[PDB]
Amino acid sequence: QIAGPLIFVEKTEPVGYNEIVNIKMGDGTVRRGQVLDSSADIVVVQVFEFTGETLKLPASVDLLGRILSGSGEPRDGGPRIVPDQLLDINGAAMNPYARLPPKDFIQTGISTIDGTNTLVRGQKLPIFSASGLPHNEIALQIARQASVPGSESAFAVVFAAMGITNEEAQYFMSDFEKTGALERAVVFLNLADDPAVERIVTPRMALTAAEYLAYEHGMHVLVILTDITNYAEALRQMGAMYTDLATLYERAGIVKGAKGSVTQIPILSMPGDDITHPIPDLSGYITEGQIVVARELHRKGIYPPINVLPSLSRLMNSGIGAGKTREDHKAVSDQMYAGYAEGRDLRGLVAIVGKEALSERDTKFLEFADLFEDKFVRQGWNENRTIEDTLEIGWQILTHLPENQLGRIDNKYIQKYHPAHR
Amino acid sequence: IAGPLIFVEKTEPVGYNEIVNIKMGDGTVRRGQVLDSSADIVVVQIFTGETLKLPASVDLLGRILSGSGEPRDGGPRIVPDQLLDINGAAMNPYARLPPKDFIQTGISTIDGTNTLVRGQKLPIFSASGLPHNEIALQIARQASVPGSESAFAVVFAAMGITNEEAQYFMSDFEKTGALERAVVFLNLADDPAVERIVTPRMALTAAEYLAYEHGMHVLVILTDITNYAEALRQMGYPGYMYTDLATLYERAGIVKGAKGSVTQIPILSMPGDDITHPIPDLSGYITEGQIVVARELHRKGIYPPINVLPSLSRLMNSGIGAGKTREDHKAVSDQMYAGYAEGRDLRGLVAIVGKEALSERDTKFLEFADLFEDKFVRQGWNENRTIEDTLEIGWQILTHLPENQLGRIDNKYIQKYHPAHR
């Protein structure tokens, strides 16, 4: 009973609980069977190591501009979905992923990720959050801001929602259209009242969309997946999941031809006390780092309440330095990392020895931390700060420190750009 | 608001919002306003008392205390050789210098891949109903620093624990004769609210007195923070609960004189089905790395089990390498991590497609992940692994990998280590 998989067939013939199916794969050779659960249109299988095509997504460039269900049903009101191609969703049978590392920077436009732990083409960088926090708000901002600068390959987004409230539905369905962010993105909208199975096929159909656009066309796609704790919830439940999620997080990367990529940012929250878990081990997703939405910053009323230094990007160096963003980048990042860390420490012995007993030096760091969260972290629902707006904002507030104790900034960079030497 | 909290030796009962004069460990005076009255401790920011001081001593090592009252072992309360204020005014012992020369914990997934360096703030990230205190003890009985001729002490502090938990913490410290190099403070889930939040501050000051003043590399385990949190809230507008939290995480680093160190491995838990708040925000404690305890790995029946992909040690580079450990340390760490990171993706691939249907290269990377969890992660609870043993078996699970293709580490280490001889 321990066996993993969970493949999605499409109901062609009426089926029954745990009947053997033994069917398909997108190449013509198949093995293994046994139904687990189903709905009016689609069948979840699950297997071990009649009949019976794998569920396929209507593949077309005309997807862009449309708004879909977990099953890809025209939710935007318009006509049907006339498909150029028609491909297997459930981890496909395409595997368009080249054995290469991720590379070259993505401009989210928000500085607490672009400038301090940069999202890189073909990464998985989850938005580590919690109930109440504005992680959806901070997500669908970067849905209409993001781009790949100077990249010869065009850019595309796949926003995907899993079992959201039917009210916050036509919210996301409006923050697009208005901005014109839609006519660049395919949306996959799942509601809490949609058949529970739909929620489990919402990520696959999203991921499958991204792969068609990234490989068949030579594009850079970003896939945001809001509230993956609703996915874990949807799964009847656990066990024996841990491999089932690996089918999801495997589906990110740079494609063959190195002329496109699948880039992944899911949001992993936790509400308070979970039902019959508490959920989970989503730690299979963070393998390349994560970004941290914090309550501490939210509470004192700053946006986005992102906390650097708990946040991490492992592949940052593979899309940062010379002729990608700017040379000084990593060197500016080290100082703000260290200065905010060393400054966040001095908020401590402020409260242990009063605001005095605190050397002049330390008052600058103490203040830098204030300036850091005021200028650097704080950002409008919009201001699409480019890496250059971001990096210079950095120097703008790095000038509250003295020098030499800026020991992570290479003198070659201060003397080049530091607001004291043109 | 600033408000420098300090803990006062209660003589006679004092009301709320009373104004008080209190002399320090360094007898002075204070801006006295009483916040809370409890046991033989009052929290401030005949008439107007003194201050609660730790009786610091060279033979504090070997003893079991708590906070107020004091010994839980029988029983001659320590004769001091210096009385010291608890919240960190005492010395003050910290050098503005980077953490340096590494601690051997005997646990490979820490040592091998996320090294613990003399002067760190490496929290353990875990969840309700996982064996963290269990792992805490292991590193508590095992820890040492091969090389440098400076003694190694261990301060162990427990907060809000059950009598049973307390029963087997003590029993373990005396069976191993590890209490001979260790101080132990255990606050009980039933002890005064004050006696819990004074707990960490007694441990750290005791640590500081030992590190400075005695030139020893002291390690402080703090188990666990969320209970500190989930008590700090019910005793004691503002939103402020941090700052006070910052008062804890500042108290780390290598001391003036460079002979001692205060390394701090606290543990923080994601709350489970029992309490009210179950968040909160202890984000500020994660700024030099983390070591995540994976639920998935636990219910695969593995101990530790810490996941290494989310695991991080920002200052690993400072502790590893030749003379400190061995040349090949980073090489092996980088290749295991990459090897394991891959293996876990392929688990997703192997599900979607089938083990019969993935590449021979991918097979021996899929199986590596099994070996990694089965022979690297997996550890006995009385297993002390010298880095030699860590890297030795690290090199074992590596031979399963295609020698004749994959390196990222090639140069000199593959020929000098690894079976290949001539």
Curated annotation (Swiss-Prot), chain A:
Domain of life: Archaea
Record-stated family: Belongs to the ATPase alpha/beta chains family.
Activity-pH dependence: Optimum pH is 5.2 for ATP hydrolysis.
Assembly mode: Has multiple subunits, A(3), B(3), C, D, E, F, G, I and K(x); there may be a few other subunits as well.
Biological process according to GO: proton motive force-driven plasma membrane ATP synthesis
Additional comment: This organism has both a Na(+)-translocating F1F0 ATP synthase and this H(+)-translocating A1A0 ATP synthase.
Listed PANTHER family: V-TYPE PROTON ATPASE SUBUNIT B
Primary location: membrane
Task performed by this protein: Component of the A-type ATP synthase that produces ATP from ADP in the presence of a proton gradient across the membrane. The B chain is a regulatory subunit.
Membrane topology designation: Peripheral membrane protein
GO CC entries: plasma membrane; proton-transporting two-sector ATPase complex, catalytic domain
Gene3D superfamilies referenced in this protein's UniProt entry, alphabetically: 3.40.50.12240
Keywords, ordered alphabetically: ATP synthesis, Cell membrane, Hydrogen ion transport, Ion transport, Membrane, Transport
Molecular-function GO terms, alphabetical: ATP binding; proton-transporting ATP synthase activity, rotational mechanism
Entry protein name: A-type ATP synthase subunit B
NCBIfam families tied to this protein: ATP_syn_B_arch (TIGR01041), PRK04196.1 (NF003235)
Originating species: Methanosarcina mazei (strain ATCC BAA-159 / DSM 3647 / Goe1 / Go1 / JCM 11833 / OCM 88)
One Pfam family cited in the UniProt record for this chain: ATP-synt_ab
